[PDB]
Amino acid sequence: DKPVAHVVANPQAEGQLQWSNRRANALLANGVELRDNQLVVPIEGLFLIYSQVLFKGQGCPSTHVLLTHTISRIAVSYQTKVNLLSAIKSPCQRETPEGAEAKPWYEPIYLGGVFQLEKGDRLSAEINRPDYLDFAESGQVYFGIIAL
Amino acid sequence: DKPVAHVVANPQAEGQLQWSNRRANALLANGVELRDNQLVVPIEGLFLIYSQVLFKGQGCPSTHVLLTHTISRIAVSYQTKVNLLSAIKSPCQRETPEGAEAKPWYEPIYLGGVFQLEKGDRLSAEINRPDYLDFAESGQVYFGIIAL
Amino acid sequence: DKPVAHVVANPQAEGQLQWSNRRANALLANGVELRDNQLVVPIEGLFLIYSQVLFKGQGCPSTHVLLTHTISRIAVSYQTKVNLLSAIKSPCQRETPEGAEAKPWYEPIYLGGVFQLEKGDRLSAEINRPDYLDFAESGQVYFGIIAL
C-alpha cells in the first residue's frame, strides 16, 4: 500500500536521460506519478530516495570533463528547485601528445538518502552529460523512491 | 518480524566471494535463507536490496581489466536469471614501458534498489574477478535485503 | 513516529567533518540525538544507516594519498568501537617530474546497510583527511539513519 517507484533509463532515448517504468523489475505504484520525466509524491511523509547513473568513455581525448549527478526537489506545485543529493566525478586526469590510446572507461555514481516530502513535490534525477551515459544494459541507470 | 539479511564476505574463502552471516553485526533472520551462496526470499513483497564490493590492485601491470558487480534475481523455483542492479569500473586507464611503478589502488562499488519479489526467489550478488577483492577488514564487502 | 536523522557537513567547520541538522532538507527527529558529532540511537531495532562523502583535489602533487570513509558503532554506553561499513579510494595512481599539471579531481564514496542496534548505541561517520573534503554545496556530504 506504500507509494513506490523504481524507474530505469529508456535505452531508446538517444542523448537524454528518459525515465521509464515499462520494464519487468521496474515499479510505479500507489500514487507516484511520472510526469515531465519527474516523480511526483502522492502524500506527505518520509521517503527513501535513490539513483545510480553509469558513464562510459573511450579513452581521455585532449581536454577536461566533469560528470555530475544530482537529485533535486521542486516543493509545493511550481515552487523553487533545491538539490537534495549530489556527486561529481572526473574521469580523466590526463591523456596528451599522441602515442597509443582509446581505452574505454566506466564510472558509476550512486546517491541515496531519507527526506521529508509533502504531497505534490516533484523529484528530478539529472546528469550534465547524457551523451556519456551507458544504459547498454541492466540495472545500470535507475531512480527510485519508497515511502517509509 | 520483517525478513532481513546482512551478510559479509567470508575472509577464509580464498579467491571466491563467499557470503556469511557468522559475524557480529551481520543478520540472517525471519525466513531469509542463505542457500548455495544465494539469498532466498521467504515471502512475496517489496524489498530494499543492496551490496558493496571493494577491489584492490597494486599498480597497473601491462594491459586492461574491467571490474563488474551485479545483483541478479532467479524468479520462481529454478526459473531464469535476470540482472536487477549492475555497475562496471575500470581501474587502469594506463601503465606501459618500465620506469617506476606498483602503487596499490582501491575501488569500491555500491548497488541498491527497491524490488517486488515473490516467495522463493533467489538473489545473487556476483563479481567477475574474485581475485581482486579486498575484505581484509571491516564492512568492506556486504550484501543485504530487508522487506519494506 | 520512527526515529530518523539526515545530517549534513557544516560548511563553516574548516578542516573537520562536523555534522549538522540545521539545514532545510535535513532531519533529527523522534529521539535520535547528535552528541559529540555522533548519532545516538533512542531505541533498540533494525536501522538503515548511510553516508556519502565527497573529496576533491587539484592534480596529483609528488606522492600517495588514500582516502577512507567508515561508519563505526560504539555499543552500550561507553563500550568498544567497531566498523560497520568502510571504503577506501586512491585518487592518484601517478603525477611526477614537471610538465603541465594541476587539474582538480572529485571522488564520491557511498556507504549504506541495515543493522540491529540497541538503545544508546552511538554511530560515527568518519574520514581520514577532512582537508580533502568538498561540501562546497548541496547534498554532497551526508549521514543518516532511519528505524525500519
Side-chain angles (χ1 to χ4, degrees), chain A residues 2-13 15 17-77 80-93 95-97 99-100 102-136 138-148, chain B residues 2-13 15 17-77 80-93 95-97 99-100 102-136 138-148, chain C residues 2-13 15 17-77 80-93 95-97 99-100 102-136 138-148:
Chain A
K2 301 186 182 200
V4 59
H6 181 89
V7 304
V8 302
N10 171 353
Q12 303 295 53
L17 177 38
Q18 212 178 97
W19 298 117
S20 183
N21 60 295
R22 323 251 87 162
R23 183 159 244 104
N25 302 304
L27 314 157
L28 195 66
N30 302 316
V32 183
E33 287 182 338
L34 192 53
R35 261 183 171 45
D36 325 309
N37 211 40
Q38 300 176 100
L39 292 183
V40 191
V41 69
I43 53 171
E44 176 213 281
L46 286 170
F47 284 82
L48 170 63
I49 309 169
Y50 65 86
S51 178
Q52 173 183 301
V53 288
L54 202 176
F55 301 107
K56 180 218 183 146
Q58 54 205 255
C60 302
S62 158
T63 170
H64 268 338
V65 191
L66 275 180
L67 285 6
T68 71
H69 179 211
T70 104
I71 291 169
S72 322
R73 180 187 162 193
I74 117 177
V76 163
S77 266
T80 192
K81 194 166 195 174
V82 56
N83 293 1
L84 291 173
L85 304 160
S86 197
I88 305 161
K89 193 169 256 177
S90 46
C92 300
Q93 225 72 286
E95 158 130 296
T96 24
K103 22 60 207 180
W105 50 258
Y106 289 84
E107 293 290 15
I109 297 179
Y110 192 88
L111 266 25
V114 173
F115 302 86
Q116 179 84 83
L117 303 187
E118 300 166 356
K119 162 208 253 167
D121 275 1
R122 282 159 174 273
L123 298 163
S124 207
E126 302 170 351
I127 59 157
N128 62 336
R129 299 286 302 266
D131 54 330
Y132 273 84
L133 276 179
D134 188 25
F135 33 69
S138 210
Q140 293 186 169
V141 187
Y142 51 82
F143 176 29
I145 68 165
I146 175 124
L148 296 187
Chain B
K2 301 186 182 200
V4 59
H6 181 89
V7 304
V8 302
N10 171 353
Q12 303 295 53
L17 177 38
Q18 212 178 97
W19 298 117
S20 183
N21 60 295
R22 323 251 87 162
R23 183 159 244 104
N25 302 304
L27 314 157
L28 195 66
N30 302 316
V32 183
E33 287 182 338
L34 192 53
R35 261 183 171 45
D36 325 309
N37 211 40
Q38 300 176 100
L39 292 183
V40 191
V41 69
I43 53 171
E44 176 213 281
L46 286 170
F47 284 82
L48 170 63
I49 309 169
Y50 65 86
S51 178
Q52 173 183 301
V53 288
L54 202 176
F55 301 107
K56 180 218 183 146
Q58 54 205 255
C60 302
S62 158
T63 170
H64 268 338
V65 191
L66 275 180
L67 285 6
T68 71
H69 179 211
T70 104
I71 291 169
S72 322
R73 180 187 162 193
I74 117 177
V76 163
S77 266
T80 192
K81 194 166 195 174
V82 56
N83 293 1
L84 291 173
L85 304 160
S86 197
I88 305 161
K89 193 169 256 177
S90 46
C92 300
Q93 225 72 286
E95 158 130 296
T96 24
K103 22 60 207 180
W105 50 258
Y106 289 84
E107 293 290 15
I109 297 179
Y110 192 88
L111 266 25
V114 173
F115 302 85
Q116 179 84 83
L117 303 187
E118 300 166 356
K119 162 208 253 167
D121 275 1
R122 282 159 174 273
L123 298 163
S124 207
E126 302 170 351
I127 59 157
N128 62 336
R129 299 286 302 266
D131 54 330
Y132 273 84
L133 276 179
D134 188 25
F135 33 69
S138 210
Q140 293 186 169
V141 187
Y142 51 82
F143 176 29
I145 68 165
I146 175 124
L148 296 187
Chain C
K2 301 186 182 200
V4 59
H6 181 89
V7 304
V8 302
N10 171 353
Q12 303 295 53
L17 177 38
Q18 212 178 97
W19 298 117
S20 183
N21 60 295
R22 323 251 87 162
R23 183 159 244 104
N25 302 304
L27 314 157
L28 195 66
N30 302 316
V32 183
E33 287 182 338
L34 192 53
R35 261 183 171 45
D36 325 309
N37 211 40
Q38 300 176 100
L39 292 183
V40 191
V41 69
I43 53 171
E44 176 213 281
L46 286 170
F47 284 82
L48 170 63
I49 309 169
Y50 65 86
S51 178
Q52 173 183 301
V53 288
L54 202 176
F55 301 107
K56 180 218 183 146
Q58 54 205 255
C60 302
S62 158
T63 170
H64 268 338
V65 191
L66 275 180
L67 285 6
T68 71
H69 179 211
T70 104
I71 291 169
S72 322
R73 180 187 162 193
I74 117 177
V76 163
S77 266
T80 192
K81 194 166 195 174
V82 56
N83 293 1
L84 291 173
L85 304 160
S86 197
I88 305 161
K89 193 169 256 177
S90 46
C92 300
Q93 225 72 286
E95 158 130 296
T96 24
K103 22 60 207 180
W105 50 258
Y106 289 84
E107 293 290 15
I109 297 179
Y110 192 88
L111 266 25
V114 173
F115 302 85
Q116 179 84 83
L117 303 187
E118 300 166 356
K119 162 208 253 167
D121 275 1
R122 282 159 174 273
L123 298 163
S124 207
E126 302 170 351
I127 59 157
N128 62 336
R129 299 286 302 266
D131 54 330
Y132 273 84
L133 276 179
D134 188 25
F135 33 69
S138 210
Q140 293 186 169
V141 187
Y142 51 82
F143 176 29
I145 68 165
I146 175 124
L148 296 187

